[PDB]
Scaffold this active site. Sequence first.
Site, short mmCIF file in Angstrom:
data_model
loop_
_atom_site.label_atom_id
_atom_site.label_comp_id
_atom_site.label_asym_id
_atom_site.label_seq_id
_atom_site.Cartn_x
_atom_site.Cartn_y
_atom_site.Cartn_z
CG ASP B 62 -1.83 1.21 1.33
OD1 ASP B 62 -1.65 2.20 0.58
OD2 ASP B 62 -2.73 1.19 2.19
CB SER B 141 -2.58 11.73 -15.76
OG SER B 141 -3.73 11.94 -16.57
CE1 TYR B 154 -6.09 10.00 -11.81
CE2 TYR B 154 -6.11 11.53 -13.67
CZ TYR B 154 -5.69 10.35 -13.09
OH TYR B 154 -4.86 9.51 -13.80
CE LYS B 158 -2.34 10.22 -11.85
NZ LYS B 158 -1.21 9.20 -11.78
#
Lengths: 241, 240, 238, 239
Positions: B62, B141, B154, B158
């Site tokens: 993790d 990304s 998100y 990123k």
Amino acid sequence: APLEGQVAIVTGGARGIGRGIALTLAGAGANILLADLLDDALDATAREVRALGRRAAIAKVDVTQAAQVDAMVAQALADLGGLDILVNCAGVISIHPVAELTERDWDFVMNVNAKGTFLGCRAALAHLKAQGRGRIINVASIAGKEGFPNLAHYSASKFAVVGFTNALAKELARDGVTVNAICPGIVRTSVEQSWQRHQLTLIPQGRAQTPEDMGRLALFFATMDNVTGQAVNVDGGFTFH
Amino acid sequence: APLEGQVAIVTGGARGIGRGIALTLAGAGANILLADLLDDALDATAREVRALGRRAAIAKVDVTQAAQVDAMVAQALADLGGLDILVNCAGVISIHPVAELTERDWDFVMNVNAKGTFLGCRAALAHLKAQGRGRIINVASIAGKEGFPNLAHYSASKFAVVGFTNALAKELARDGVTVNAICPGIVRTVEQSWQRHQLTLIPQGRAQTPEDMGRLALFFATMDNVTGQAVNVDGGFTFH
Amino acid sequence: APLEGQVAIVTGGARGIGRGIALTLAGAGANILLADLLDDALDATAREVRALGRRAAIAKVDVTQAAQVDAMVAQALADLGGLDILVNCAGVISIHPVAELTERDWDFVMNVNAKGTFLGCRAALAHLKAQGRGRIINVASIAGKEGFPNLAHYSASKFAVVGFTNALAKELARDGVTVNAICPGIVREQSWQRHQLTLIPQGRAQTPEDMGRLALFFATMDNVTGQAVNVDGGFTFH
Amino acid sequence: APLEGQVAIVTGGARGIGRGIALTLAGAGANILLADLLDDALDATAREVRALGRRAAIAKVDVTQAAQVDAMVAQALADLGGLDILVNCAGVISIHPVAELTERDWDFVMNVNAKGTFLGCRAALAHLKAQGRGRIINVASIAGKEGFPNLAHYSASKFAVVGFTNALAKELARDGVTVNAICPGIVRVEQSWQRHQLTLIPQGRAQTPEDMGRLALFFATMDNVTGQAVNVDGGFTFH
Ligand SMILES: [Cl-]
Ligand SMILES: [Mg+2]
Ligand SMILES: [Mg+2]
């Protein structure tokens, strides 16, 4: 007074850049809710807003706490009768190489700088969308445009703010709410002092920028319907990205 | 075999982009430590690495847990005898307008995507610096270059990875360790409908693949004089 | 009147974005030298500047011609008694895929948009530097931030303006002169524009007055330099 | 040999970065048409390509002249039997503050660096489009990402190449042709300037023609990368 009749919330508004932005928006006609953690500083800056002929409200707000951020928005509506502008200017910084960064260091900067901005923006959406006009102004940094060594966590947090700003702008683009970021270069306040002094040598103009400079940019965003999603650098030429 | 004798750790390496990168690096000669949370997938991808003639180790990690990330680095050194390349490719995504985002949504994406990358990089520093050569490869990304509506969290995470990559690159620039980011465009797997619509926005009009990402990972791993970069593999969607 | 006592040159100032910028700066107190190729439009816009209570001068200027651009700066000093702000807003566009672009198409856009901006900046430099204060404002485009298909030559020219702007800003950063760019989005070829609005998150065009507002911002910000700011309803933020 | 059977044109291919790219592509299997203005260098580099087991052709080309650029593309088709890759690596630089820049200075840099790239790309389009596959690789510079003081004209020209690259990539995105840019950092008056610029490179060392050849080979073998301008620069910029 382009902002006559309007209300602005400024988080981190009691001193430094936040104070500069609050006093500039107040000068342009806006009533101000000052949100910060510094009791005496909040009182002093409130007196300055009132000295400009505006109304001022104060909130003791930890921007990492959603309930406090929601109460902050509720207080602007209740105490000042509205909300038109939200300035997220709460921010923290520390200097450590990644090898020496603790999880506490990482989480503190990310939670205050980035999560705190998310929570502030989220809390204001329902009201700003309903009234069909609004200004969200996030204060990032040139460290949100360039990675700074020994400030990697701070850069991550400020990059996060830049990206968050642009994405939220696109969500609200047809809602009449603009979302933009101010990216200060070096605004003065030892390791930090020595770091600050050295960074000035890297600024093409070779001098620091001021809270008042940032306030001027905030006033520009607050009065520009057709500017959204931008992250504008006030930095004496350090970066233009 | 440009990476003969080298060892790579790939977090999120059991499936998707991580698997693609792992297999590309293995094909290029590197032995691989695969780190992920999917037991059967870890086993399957390990078999694929060995089928390429390489050694493989697996760790159940993790990436939000610093102790597990440290143990991961220790295991590459103990099981495979070294470490040359760290690929941070653990990542999660969800789609919600900011008005509907919960704190859990925000924290999950930021902790896995950004903090996990910070923890992985931090754990590998001492070893890579000591040996005077290393490659750190973060998978961001195109959402780290452009804000995507309904993916604001998100995007934040990123963007954080892109900025972190560039900053760390500068810290390690005289240590012989390069630090770069891979920025995937659309790599297939509400989510499906979103994916399908995004393809219409790609100039080439088609998705990119884990193998494309592996090719960029191999490029970074074999380029001494490239550091701090975040390169888009995205069919032309963005070039920033 | 933040620009009280100051003088601005605006190339392409007779119409469109240039006119919007001239009128905003004039409204903020600046006397204006309007430089363009349109005689009647020049006279009309000059009358509008005078209606704002300002002095106006007119110059017939092809910005690709260094002698005309130099004379323009000399005329500002001679007719209006000084020079504080230069706005380079002459610009041309055409739409062709690269496969269909002629050399004339390339040179026209590059000479007007990029070389014309170089010549304007170069001509104003000595005076602004000597007085230790000045504002240079170039008008690029969002096409200077993103490559536009069927506009590769136009993008090349506007990218050139963005880069030129940043470089010159750095040369003059300790001289008290700032150098910045305005990047307009879509300001209402017609079919192309309508199609481009789909790319604007706000779904509406921007105006010459919007650009004038950014010009006024640059003109009154000592500590902003080298920047290329998009006024584009969210199209790009790079 | 990933480029086996392919043909590449490299303008400015006789020396420096152009030569490095030519030798990398030739090493990877491509036959090469070298286009340049240096007679002896062209011969020497051609011998190096042939030493790699590849075929080489030579063209004396001023990239600012459309007819010569068209003839160059025609020669690849006639001499080497095809064309798959075009590398535009003709480039010139000079150092002057804007206050001292002449029109000759501006035009020289803009015409060679930007217009020459436009002309090279335009000449190759019809053929690359018709076969449904191709690679166009433009060599810009980190000065195409950041404005450099005393190089404002050079930056203008390289910014232009970056924007042109992205725009053309979009025109050709469904045609099977990718269009990308290589942005070199510092590759060893000009010398003194270079020494000073190294202070701005985090790694503190220059990059090499071989580095640029490696990126060229990457673009040449990546179907799904287009419109990009990738910096090979020891960390100077990441934009
Ligand atoms: Cl100072
Ligand atoms: Mg509405
Ligand atoms: Mg060392």
